[PDB]
Chain A
Amino acid sequence: GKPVWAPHPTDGFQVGNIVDIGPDSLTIEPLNQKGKTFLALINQVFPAEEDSKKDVEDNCSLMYLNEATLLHNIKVRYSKDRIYTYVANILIAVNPYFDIPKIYSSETIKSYQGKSLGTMPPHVFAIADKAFRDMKVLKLSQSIIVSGESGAGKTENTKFVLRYLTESYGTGQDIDDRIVEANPLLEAFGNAKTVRNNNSSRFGKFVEIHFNEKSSVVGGFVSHYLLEKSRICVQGKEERNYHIFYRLCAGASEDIRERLHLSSPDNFRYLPLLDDHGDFIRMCTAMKKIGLDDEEKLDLFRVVAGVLHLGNIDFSTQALEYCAELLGLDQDDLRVSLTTPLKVEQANNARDALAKTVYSHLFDHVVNRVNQCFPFETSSYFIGVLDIAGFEYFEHNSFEQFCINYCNEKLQQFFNERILKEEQELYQKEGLGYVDNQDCIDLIEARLVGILDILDEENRLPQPSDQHFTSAVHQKHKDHFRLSIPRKSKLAIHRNIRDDEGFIIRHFAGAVCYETTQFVEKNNDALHMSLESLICESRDKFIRELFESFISVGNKFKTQLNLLLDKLRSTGASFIRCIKPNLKMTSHHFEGAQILSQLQCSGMVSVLDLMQGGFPSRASFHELYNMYKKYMPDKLARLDPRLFCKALFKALGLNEIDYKFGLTKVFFRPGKFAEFDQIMKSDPDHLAELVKRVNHWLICSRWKKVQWCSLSVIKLKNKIKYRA
């Protein structure tokens, strides 16, 4: 029969033919591989678009909207350097891994201003404009949630959003500049080279642009989440510490270099297409532009350098001299603090915990300092852009992944609620007529009985243990639908993990097996009081002000996340789903299964499932008229897309169940657009005959349209007189 899409282990889907049908699974022959057969579940074989060469800007224009046809549409577009595609209001953005021309220019920015979604090609600029327009018209704060794996393109698209908004609707001066320079400055202190991203954000952010009642920019505000503390001291083989460290070492003047006792990064225990020298220059530029004087800039530099030398003390004399000097401490006070009777391992961890605490508090200071550069007393609305990593494959899932996957559960719920709301409003407006993950959220975060609280309890015990904590989780949530023991896994390596050494959580994106070693220690952000007192009595004013025994990481983040959701829930929301095409940072390399998996994990396939419940195919009268006028008589091709479509509906006699003539679009039940396309592609003469028998009605419709239009103009004329 007709070719169909069927699973492919590396392409996600492949073309094949159904050669046999079973009650559970179908037999598929891959295209041209006669003799080769394989089995697929019925629910994993999908109809394909007859035209395999076309692409559509909005996936709702496909005759068959499923995960396979969507994968293919996005694939075609990507191969033509069209990285952006809609699923109704949702933007899918595939990372190109190269600089595509024209599409980010200031002149392109201008072409997007004031345009409705779908009047211009899909773009991050269009999502940004709709958010400004909705804020102004609806008088409602707005959020743009940009999601995806590390290296998917979240930070870049966030920066495109902020470029667009300031250029289009900014003040003209000096606050616009500070909005676009804020993040690159934060990236110095919060970004790092990882194995997934050369410029990975090791923190989450919500960046708000605030407006007055006249929807004019009055300020900005940045919230930050979960700075990766462990990277400060140790990093993986093919990874780096935060950019600042290398930028300072590379680009500082000889004067600063002597003051801070700096060398090449290879002289520091804590430490290419990476231009550290150039980036330092750009950083100083940003710093001056946002209003940092050289004193503050150097106060920042000294602390950074102080942390570097601190890491050079192993259990050194010169490093101790430099560190105590820069951090404003007495050498002896510091030496004692790192050794009071301690073993070598305990001494390393004291030095490391101080370095982490100092740096993290510096990052808090830098984020606050940035907010101090575009402050506001009051505002009416904001447009906020959320840039945080979601679920992603790790071979070992520890506490960091636990926190990020918990965040994803809460944000995915918001997305689910919002996408449902958007669809309901459409069906009601046009006259067309779920499974929460709250239980998984509750497992993690509920007071007293949730994992976060159980973890905190362990931290407070006289002898905390990862194993005691893990067992407490398993006993409390033995029968929870979302919780499982590793030895139940289908994968051998999970089964190697003892009951008290991990657990499985059935997250939105799929089961995750957590190894719980180090959960207790990772949940604690506190610094020992012997170390905190030391740094609090620094001869230096700046080091004292950074700071002016247990602190829960998980519950601190829960508080932050709940505040974020309060904000998000008060906004109208738009969603950009970013997609990493491969694991190699290379352009023109579309890895179908990797991309398919992202589409599944981020909830897009679920969104498609929802739309198959109603009218998944949606086409404007203009789009249809352009597609099908060539099949009709010249007389009909001379209308007027609305009347053209009206005449088709009348001539074909399309039923009210399958076809909805909307306010501006035709809405089709599943399979019905394909049936309509089929009707249009037969049988020229019979089609002509169907139009013929509708002729009188069509002439009358034409008459009345113009007759009732002139009556409208008379009433409008008379109204203007009534008002005068």
Chain B
Amino acid sequence: QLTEEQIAEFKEAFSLFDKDGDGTITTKELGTVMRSLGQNPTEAELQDMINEVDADGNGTIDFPEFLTMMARKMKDTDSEEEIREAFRVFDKDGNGFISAAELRHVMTNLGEKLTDEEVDEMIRESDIDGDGQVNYEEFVTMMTS
């Protein structure tokens, strides 16, 4: 299970699913956010995953149920691969660096509203080595803050 801090981060991430907020989500929001980040689950796959925690039967899910749904037995090697995979969601061209334009793609896919100037500020605050781009180390450091 999760640390108090991990839970806190996922709760903020959950608001991106639960946009009306509200506090609950359905299969509808699951797929949209999933597609928004380059995944393409079918409706039967969503329905079947929902089934574990929709206990219930009403087709809606709250935050603790969402955490349970993300949970599974993992290898020693698994959590690092997932974080690397998250970085690749941002680094769309696979050159090892997240550019301003790549962040904007992700931000805007998720419905975030900010100016190009504010996209540049985000890059600047994460950009520790100062080359104007976010590499893996800096990405992780930010995620861990």
Contacts and interface: CB of A to CB of B under 8 A. Distances in A.
Interface string B99-128: 000000011001011110010011001100
Contacts of A713: 33-34, 37, 39, 89
B125 A699 contact: yes
Residue among A136, A620, A640 with most chain B CB within 10 A: A640
Contact of B16 (A136, A705, A722): A705
Contacts of B115: 638
A709 B20 CA distance: 16
Interface in B16-64: 16-17, 20-23, 30, 33-34, 37, 39, 41, 45, 48-49, 56-58, 63
Interface string B59-82: 000010000011110000010001
A709 B45 contact: no
Given A696-B125, A704-B13, 17 more contacts: A635-B118, A638-B114, A640-B15, A640-B113, A642-B15, A664-B21, A699-B122, A704-B143, A705-B12, A709-B33, A709-B110, A710-B86, A713-B34, A716-B41, A717-B34, A719-B71, A723-B49
Contact of A706 (B16, B63, B118): B16
Given A704-B143, A709-B13, A718 B58 contact: no
B72 A707 contact: no
Given A706-B107, A710-B90, A719 B72 contact: yes
Contacts of B121: 699
A700 B121 CA distance: 11
Given A664-B21, A716-B70, A722-B72, A707 B48 contact: no
Nearest to A720: B45
Given A663-B23, A664-B23, A713-B33, A700 B112 contact: no
Interface in A621-656: 621-622, 635, 638-643
B30 A708 contact: no
Interface residues of A, number: 41
8 contacts: A137-B58, A640-B112, A664-B21, A706-B13, A707-B143, A710-B37, A712-B10, A713-B39
B118 A638 contact: yes
B1 to A, nearest CB: 13
B18 to A, nearest CB: 9
Given A713-B33, A719-B49, A707 B142 contact: yes
A705 B58 contact: no
B21 A621 contact: yes
B139 interface: yes
A716 B30 contact: yes
A489 interface: no
B56 to A, nearest CB: 7
A640 B13 CA distance: 12
B69 A719 contact: yes
Interface in A653-704: 663-664, 696, 699-704
Contacts of A696: 125
A715 interface: yes
Contacts of A706: 13, 16, 106-107, 110, 112
B106 A700 contact: no
Given A700-B125, A701-B12, A712 B70 contact: yes
A715 B12 contact: no
Contacts of B72: 715, 718-719, 722
Residue among A137, A639, A715, A717 with most chain B CB within 10 A: A715
Nearest to A697: B145
A31 interface: no
A588 B70 CA distance: 56
A714 interface: yes
B contacts with A: majority SS: helix
Nearest to B48: A723
A620 B34 CA distance: 26
A700 B145 contact: yes
A715 B143 contact: no
Contacts of B143: 703-704, 707-708, 711
Given A638-B118, A715-B82, A716-B34, A704 B89 contact: no
B129 interface: no
B58 A136 contact: yes
A715 to B, nearest CB: 4
Contacts of B89: 710, 713-714
Contacts of B63: 663
Contact of A720 (B49, B57, B106, B113): B49
B21 A642 contact: yes
Nearest to B144: A704
A91 to B, nearest CB: 21
A707 B86 contact: yes
Contacts of B58: 136-137
A663 B66 CA distance: 15
Nearest to B45: A720
What 8 A-B pairs are tightest by C-beta distance, nearest first? Answer: A708-B13, A709-B13, A715-B70, A708-B9, A707-B143, A699-B125, A710-B86, A710-B89
A708 B33 CA distance: 12
B85 interface: yes
B115 to A, nearest CB: 8
B39 to A, nearest CB: 5
A703 B142 contact: yes
A718 B48 contact: no
Contacts of B45: 720, 724
A622 B69 CA distance: 27
Contact of A708 (B10, B41, B85): B10
A49 B72 CA distance: 52
A702 B48 CA distance: 31
Residue among A620, A641, A710, A724 with most chain B CB within 10 A: A710
A28 to B, nearest CB: 43
Contacts of A136: 58
A709 B66 CA distance: 12
A638 B108 CA distance: 12
A710 B17 CA distance: 11
B71 to A, nearest CB: 8
Interface string A588-626: 000000000000000000000000000000001110000
A703 B122 contact: yes
A137 B69 contact: no
Interface in A164-215: none
A717 B39 contact: yes
Nearest to A696: B125
B59 to A, nearest CB: 10
Nearest to B85: A714
Residue among B12, B83, B121 with most chain A CB within 10 A: B12
Residue among B48, B122, B143 with most chain A CB within 10 A: B143
Residue among A621, A641, A702 with most chain B CB within 10 A: A702
Interface in A398-440: none
Nearest to A622: B21
Contacts of A641: 21
B118 A664 contact: no
A723 B20 CA distance: 29
A700 B9 CA distance: 11
A707 B39 contact: no
